[PDB]
């Protein structure tokens, strides 16, 4: 790979420079190179990886939605063709992330924070593939996303407190999966309510560091619940 000749520490440094310059495609490429060195990522390095690829795929998803909305309720082939181009690029980025998770990052060892973080990421990027897939492929992708999310949930409920921001963000995303991807509004609503309820019941045991982080996500859960009811 193009980063094979660069020192791990220099790749991390350059990822941070790319973030400052808002060059997220570069940032993701540096972090991919760092992952491929084969060593575990620190918490700070996990966040760099996630920020980089979330920004890359976030832009592709937003474009795909723009084009898909123009295509729907609308003729020449141009809009479909360009929507398909964006879709293909998006799938390529998701396949890269999922390959990195499988080949390097998801392991039986390590603390709960790291194991849940990577399994949630796996569920998220399968969910992004599901947003654009059709037919038998979409059914396979949905089951893969569910399986990853459920493995992350099983860990988070045994190894993390109900106010932990990673556990909360996982439940939030899995409930979105239930509502938007899996056609299971009742499971989405249930999961989001239970998750909010149990966070609220334990809010007094919250360490200052993770106050804003926790309540921000609790806010997102409630605002989704407003919509699904």
């Amino acid at each position: 790979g193009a980063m094979g000749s660069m020192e791990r520490a220099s790749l991390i440094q350059k990822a941070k420079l790319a973030e400052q310059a808002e060059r997220y495609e570069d940032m993701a490429a540096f972090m991919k190179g760092a992952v491929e060195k084969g060593e575990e990522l620190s918490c700070e390095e996990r966040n760099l990886l996630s920020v980089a690829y979330k920004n890359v795929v976030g832009g592709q998803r937003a474009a795909w939605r723009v084009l898909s909305s123009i295509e729907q309720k609308s003729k020449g082939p141009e809009v479909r063709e360009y929507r398909e181009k964006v879709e293909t690029e998006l799938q390529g980025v998701c396949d890269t992330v999922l390959g990195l998770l499988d080949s390097h990052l998801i392991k039986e060892a390590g603390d709960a924070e790291s194991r849940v973080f990577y399994l949630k990421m796996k569920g998220d990027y399968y969910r992004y593939l599901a947003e654009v897939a059709t037919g038998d492929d979409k059914k396979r992708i949905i089951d893969s996303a569910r399986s990853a999310y459920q493995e992350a949930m099983d860990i988070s409920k045994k190894e993390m407190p109900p106010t932990n921001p990673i556990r909360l963000g996982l439940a939030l995303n899995f409930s979105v999966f239930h509502y938007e991807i899996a056609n299971s509004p009742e499971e989405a609503i249930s999961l989001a309510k239970t998750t909010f309820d149990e966070a609220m019941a334990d809010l007094h045991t919250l360490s200052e560091d993770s106050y804003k982080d926790s309540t921000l996500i609790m806010q997102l859960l409630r605002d989704n619940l407003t919509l699904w009811t």
Binding site: D124, G169, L170, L172, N173, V176, Y179, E180, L216, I217, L220, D223, N224, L227, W228
Partner: peptide
């Protein structure tokens, strides 16, 4: 209209 982890 719903939101995922931000």
């Amino acid at each position: 209209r719903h939101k995922s982890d931000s």
